[PDB]
């Protein structure tokens, strides 16, 4: 399980003008430093980039839920060999689009069996929307409440409002109560 | 279970003039950043948009209560196939309009059986009213008490009035005491 | 159980002049934002509007107490069918006017049986009086103590007097000690 993204957000999609109105190379540097901070706490994507979940062994035979939460249209499910055969399989799975458990389950059988050493790599487009105007506005406000904080204080100094950065992203985090076997 | 809305609120319905009188592109940016924050804590809609609850398996055979609370006039209950047959069924259910458990129960039998892989998608119009003047005024005041706070402080700084933002929306949240099987 | 009111208070009944003397489109906006806040905590009505308790199944066979507390003169008890037969029944019940349990019990038998899917809708006139001068003056003072607070501070900032907003409405709330089956 690697999950290294393919292409980053270009920056023409991030709201540098709207952030500036909320309060440019530094402004862009705090917007993404607050997007990465929030999407690392909530396991979201928020700009619908392209990822590559290149793992080596399925956790189940009808599973391997994807780490990044808002997912749509898995592009390919490649099965390399020990030498890198890079053969794309096209059938045997289906993405169950959920905000809770974005998973790629099966087609009535097991996942495409993984060659010994031949890791499987899945590339998908996970995120809310391609443009900033497609995000949930409470998650967009949390990015602003955080980026505007990174901008106003440069080193780790100290100052809990009713709906702060935490209270806004507390409903986008993943709720898990399993630290066990399955 | 996806629940991605179809069309957002245009903004001509949000009370930018009344909010300005309470204290315009920034004002509109804090009104919806406070509507989304409050309707995410109370699981309400407040402007009666159109949604799409596209799930894959019913939780019961006479159930699948809808996530957004104030619901009216489910438009369609489509049953796609594995290829996307998009066949709309017209009978077999009924919406029980409740503020507590907005559910689409049955017609004396099971729900329309879901094709294997052929997710069911339900599109409904959930909300209080089409215009801002139809909201419960205490929920409308909570949006103002929150939006006027997002406007007066830009980053997460600190300052509990008798009926604050929390005490006003505490009676619109969903009260659940089941974390179990049914 | 929906309980969506029919017609709101016009505003010519709310005491905008008396509130102004206590301290006009904003004043009217805080009066109703404090009436809705107090009547949501006490489950009262205070202006005797018209409601529609459109439920689907009686909780008992000699019951279905009404949610809004001060009730008088239930207008109709309609029994629609699965298609909306909208047939008004006229006998079989009686309203027991109480401030504690405003209930519509029976006439020596069960309630009018509800058609399968054919929800029953009850429309009543619940409230203290048609004019503001008919309210209990302690409940009217609580609306002023709250509306005058919404007016003097616009966002959720902080500051318990002997008879405050809470101590005045603490005797109008519903006291319930059943979270059980009956």
């Amino acid at each position: 399980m690697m999950l290294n993204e393919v292409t980053a957000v270009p920056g023409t999609a991030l709201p540098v003008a709207e952030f500036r109105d909320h309060l440019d190379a530094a402004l862009l540097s705090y917007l993404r430093a607050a997007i990465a901070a929030i999407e690392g706490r909530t396991a979201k994507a928020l700009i619908s980039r392209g990822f590559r979940l290149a793992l080596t062994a399925w956790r189940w035979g009808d599973m391997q839920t994807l780490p990044i939460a808002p997912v749509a249209t898995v592009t390919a499910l490649r099965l390399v060999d020990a030498a890198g055969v890079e053969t794309p399989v096209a059938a045997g799975w289906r993405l169950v689009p959920d905000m809770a458990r974005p998973r790629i389950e099966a087609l009535g059988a097991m996942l495409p069996m993984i060659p010994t050493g031949g890791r499987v790599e899945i590339d998908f487009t996970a995120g809310f929307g391609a443009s900033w105007s497609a995000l949930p506005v409470d998650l967009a406000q949390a990015v602003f409440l955080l980026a505007a904080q990174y901008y106003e204080l440069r080193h780790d100094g100290a100052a809990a409002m009713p709906f702060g950065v935490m209270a806004l992203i507390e409903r986008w985090r993943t709720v898990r109560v399993l630290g066990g076997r399955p | 279970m996806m629940l991605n809305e179809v069309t957002a609120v245009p903004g001509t319905a949000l009370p930018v003039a009344e909010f300005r009188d309470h204290l315009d592109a920034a004002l509109l940016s804090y009104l919806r950043a406070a509507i989304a924050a409050i309707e995410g804590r109370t699981a309400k809609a407040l402007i009666s948009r159109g949604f799409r609850l596209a799930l894959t398996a019913w939780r019961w055979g006479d159930m699948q209560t809808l996530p957004i609370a104030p619901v009216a006039t489910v438009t369609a209950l489509r049953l796609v196939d594995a290829a996307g047959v998009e066949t709309p069924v017209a009978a077999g259910w009924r919406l029980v309009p409740d503020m507590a458990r907005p559910r689409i129960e049955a017609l004396g039998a099971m729900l329309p059986m879901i094709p294997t892989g052929g997710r069911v998608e339900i599109d409904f119009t959930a909300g209080f009213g089409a215009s801002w003047s139809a909201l419960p005024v205490d929920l409308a005041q909570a949006v103002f008490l929150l939006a006027a706070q997002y406007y007066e402080l830009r980053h997460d700084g600190a300052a509990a009035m008798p009926f604050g933002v929390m005490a006003l929306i505490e009676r619109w949240r969903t009260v659940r005491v089941l974390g179990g099987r049914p | 159980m929906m309980l969506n009111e029919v017609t709101a208070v016009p505003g010519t009944a709310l005491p905008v002049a008396e509130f102004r003397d206590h301290l006009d489109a904003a004043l009217l906006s805080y009066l109703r934002a404090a009436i809705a806040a107090i009547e949501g905590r006490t489950a009262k009505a205070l202006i005797s509007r018209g409601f529609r308790l459109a439920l689907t199944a009686w909780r008992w066979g000699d019951m279905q107490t009404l949610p809004i507390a001060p009730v008088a003169t239930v207008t109709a008890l309609r029994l629609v069918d699965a298609a909306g037969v909208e047939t008004p029944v006229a006998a079989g019940w009686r309203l027991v006017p109480d401030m504690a349990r405003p209930r519509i019990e029976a006439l020596g038998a069960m309630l009018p049986m509800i058609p399968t899917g054919g929800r029953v809708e009850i429309d009543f006139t619940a409230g203290f009086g048609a004019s503001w001068s008919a309210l209990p003056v302690d409940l009217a003072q609580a609306v002023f103590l709250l509306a005058a607070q919404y007016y003097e501070l616009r966002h959720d900032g902080a500051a318990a007097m002997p008879f405050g907003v809470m101590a005045l409405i603490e005797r109008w709330r519903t006291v319930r000690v059943l979270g059980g089956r009956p």
Binding site: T174, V175, L178, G179 | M1, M166, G179, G180, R181 | -
Partner: protein, 98 residues
């Protein structure tokens, strides 16, 4: 006549104690970032699933139940379990036969 009432009422005490009594095996306390806050339906369906599948049943007795920040599991008990009016019903049964 009194021993019959004590026997009838203590027997209906045990029966009613089984018909209407909420014994939970625990509770998943979710305060949240605020002092109080519910979890979205997207987090409920996820949580209601991981509890039903992995943490409920006889075949799931001991799963270590990773608890994130904010979440908490308070194991609840049932303090008086046996012998509710046990001897007072037995002594009443002996006084009827007496």
């Amino acid at each position: 006549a009194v021993a019959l009432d004590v026997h009838n009422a203590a027997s209906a005490w045990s029966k009613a104690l089984l018909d209407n009594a909420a014994r939970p095996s625990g509770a998943i306390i979710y305060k949240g970032a605020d002092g109080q806050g519910v979890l979205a339906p997207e987090q409920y369906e996820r949580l209601i699933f991981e509890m039903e599948t992995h943490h409920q049943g006889a075949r799931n007795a001991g799963r270590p139940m990773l608890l994130e920040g904010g979440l908490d599991w308070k194991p609840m008990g049932f303090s008086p379990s046996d012998m509710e009016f046990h001897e007072t019903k037995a002594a009443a049964a002996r006084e009827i036969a007496l």
